Structure formats: C-alpha cells, structure tokens
Amino acid sequence: QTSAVQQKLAALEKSSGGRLGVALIDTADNTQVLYRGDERFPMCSTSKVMAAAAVLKQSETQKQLLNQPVEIKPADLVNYNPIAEKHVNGTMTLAELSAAALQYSDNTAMNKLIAQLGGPGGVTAFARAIGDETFRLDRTEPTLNTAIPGDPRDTTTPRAMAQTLRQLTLGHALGETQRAQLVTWLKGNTTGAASIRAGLPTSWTVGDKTGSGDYGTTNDIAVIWPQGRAPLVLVTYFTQPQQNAESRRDVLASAARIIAEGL
Ligand SMILES: O=C(Nc1cccc(-c2nn[nH]n2)c1)c1cc(C(F)(F)F)cc2[nH]cnc12
Numbered sequence: 158q159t160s161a162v163q164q165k166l167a168a169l170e171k172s173s174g175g176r177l178g179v180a181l182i183d184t185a186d187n188t189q190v191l192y193r194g195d196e197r198f199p200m201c202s203t204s205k206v207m208a209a210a211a212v213l214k215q216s217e218t219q220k221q222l223l224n225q226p227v228e229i230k231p232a233d234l235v236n237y238n239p240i241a242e243k244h245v246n247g248t249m250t251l252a253e254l255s256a257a258a259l260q261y262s263d264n265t266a267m268n269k270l271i272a273q274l275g276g277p278g279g280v281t282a283f284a285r286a287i288g289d290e291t292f293r294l295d296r297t298e299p300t301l302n303t304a305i306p307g308d309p310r311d312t313t314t315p316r317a318m319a320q321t322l323r324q325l326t327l328g329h330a331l332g333e334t335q336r337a338q339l340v341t342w343l344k345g346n347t348t349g350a351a352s353i354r355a356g357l358p359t360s361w362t363v364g365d366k367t368g369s370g371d372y373g374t375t376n377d378i379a380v381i382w383p384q385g386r387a388p389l390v391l392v393t394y395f396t397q398p399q400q401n402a403e404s405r406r407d408v409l410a411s412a413a414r415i416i417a418e419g420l
C-alpha cells in the first residue's frame with residue numbers, strides 16, 4: 158500500500174529532483190513509517206554515531222578508555238577539523254574526540270574513533286554485534302563522503318539506521334551510563350537546526366547527527382522527545398543526481414514536517 162504520508166513524501170521528492178529516504182519509528186506503539194526504507198543511501202557523517210557508540214561499548218569494559226590521552230599530529234588533519242586542529246601536537250581524550258565528532262562533525266575526530274576500532278570494518282563489526290546487518294563502513298574521512306550513486310560503500314538503509322538509533326539511544330545496545338552519554342552528546346549537537354528539527358514543533362526536544370557529501374547528499378538522524386508523546390526516531394536521507402549538487406537541508410525539514418503532521 159501507499160499511505161497519505163508516503164504520497165506526500167513522494168510529492169516532496171518529485172519536486173526536489175533527488176532521491177529521499179525516510180524511516181520513522183514511533184516508540185509509543187513501535188509503528189514504522191518508511192519511504193524508500195530499504196534502499197541504500199550514503200551515510201556521510203551520520204556514520205559518526207555508530208563510531209562513537211562503538212567506542213562507548215568498548216568503554217563498558219574499560220572505565221578509563223574515555224580519559225586516556227590520544228596524540229593529535231599535523232598530518233592527522235583532514236578537511237574539516239574545527240576542534241582537532243586546536244590540539245595538533247597535543248592530545249585529546251576519546252571522550253573529547255567523540256564529542257567533537259558528534260557535536261561539531263569534526264572529521265579528524267571521527268578518524269581517531271575509527272582507528273581506535275581498528276579501521277572502518279571495526280565500526281561495521283559493532284553494528285553487526287547490535288543486530289544491524291545492513292550498515293557498512295568501508296573508508297575513513299573524508300573519502301567516505303564521496304556519495305557516488307550506486308556505490309555500496311559507506312551506506313545503510315533508512316530502516317536499518319532508525320532501528321539501530323533506537324537501540325542505541327532508547328534501548329539496551331549500550332549500558333545505561335553509555336546510552337545516557339550518547340543522548341547527552343546528540344542533544345548538544347551544534348549542526349542540526351536547519352534539518353529535521355526545522356520541520357518539527359518547537360516544543361519538541363531533538364538530539365541529532367547531520368551529514369552531507371558529494372551529489373548534494375544531505376542527511377540527518379534524530380531521536381525526538383515530542384511534547385505529550387513517547388519518543389520518536391527519525392532518519393531522513395537525501396541524495397541528488399549531479400556530483401556538484403547543492404545541499405538541501407530544507408528537504409529534510411519538509412520530510413520531518415510531513416511525518417509530524419501524519420502522527
Ligand atoms: O563542513 C561542511 N562541509 C564540508 C567540509 C569539508 C569539505 C567539504 C567539501 N569538499 N568538497 N566539497 N565540499 C564540505 C558542512 C556542510 C553542511 C551542508 F550545509 F549540509 F552542506 C553542513 C555542515 N554543518 C557542519 N559542517 C557542514
């Protein structure tokens with residue numbers, strides 16, 4: 158079937174010229190709303206959530222992991238390093254790297270998380286350990302954002318990412334302390350106000366992680382605490398045919414508004 162919500166998402170997509178993927182989980186009833194829910198999309202920096210969560214999982218058996226000093230070197234800097242470049246020739250802890258990756262979208266910080274996990278495949282391995290058979294991380298920053306149509310590398314589906322984000326932030330994929338830390342980090346994101354949150358009533362609280370890449374790829378994944386409702390998890394992924402396409406955070410906001418209006 159095609160629901161009213163799905164037809165409105167399709168109309169948004171058609172007007173936009175790109176390809177839109179949406180997955181909602183409403184935790185008040187566990188119901189799902191999907192649009193291209195089983196199609197693959199480039200994750201871009203939304204993958205930083207899985208990397209940070211994988212490090213949080215490692216920290217469950219190492220109380221000091223998040224506090225040990227990690228050296229930052231000049232050659233570590235990549236293409237977007239607002240936090241890490243201030244610590245070149247110094248150190249950052251894995252907590253600081255997690256916070257920088259999640260809240261500032263720092264790509265050098267993400268590479269340190271990936272390295273702690275043994276490379277991109279260590280991030281994939283954690284996904285599999287928490288029941289996500291779909292996620293794959295294949296490259297480091299910045300090349301994981303090439304976002305080439307048809308390329309499976311560094312992709313997931315909306316359905317899989319919503320399920321995983323629910324398990325990480327609201328469920329029991331992480332220990333209690335670690336889940337709370339992840340939620341605190343997401344709620345303190347600096348980059349999200351133009352994306353999913355722009356489509357929702359202002360009174361609802363959002364924690365989210367954005368991403369963007371080539372092909373005008375524009376993404377957001379969010380855990381939402383609505384006014385007067387159980388929490389929601391929402392994934393909105395968007396990608397365009399032209400490599401040089403401009404980002405379209407407004408499309409994500411529009412998708413979120415349709416979802417909210419459909420509840
Ligand atoms: O920093 C960003 N993008 C970036 C960084 C490094 C390099 C390149 C790039 N490399 N080749 N073309 N562009 C692009 C960024 C973009 C976006 C937007 F609007 F969605 F596109 C939102 C953000 N919020 C925080 N940072 C961002």
Ligand SMILES: O=C(Nc1cccc(-c2nn[nH]n2)c1)c1cc(C(F)(F)F)cc2[nH]cnc12
Pocket residue numbers: 202236237262263264299300301302303304348367368369370371372
């Ligand atoms: O790294 C990149 N973008 C980036 C960096 C940091 C943060 C964010 C971001 N965080 N939240 N939204 N956007 C996005 C990027 C990389 C590349 C390439 F070639 F693969 F290396 C091409 C790009 N075209 C547009 N952006 C890119």
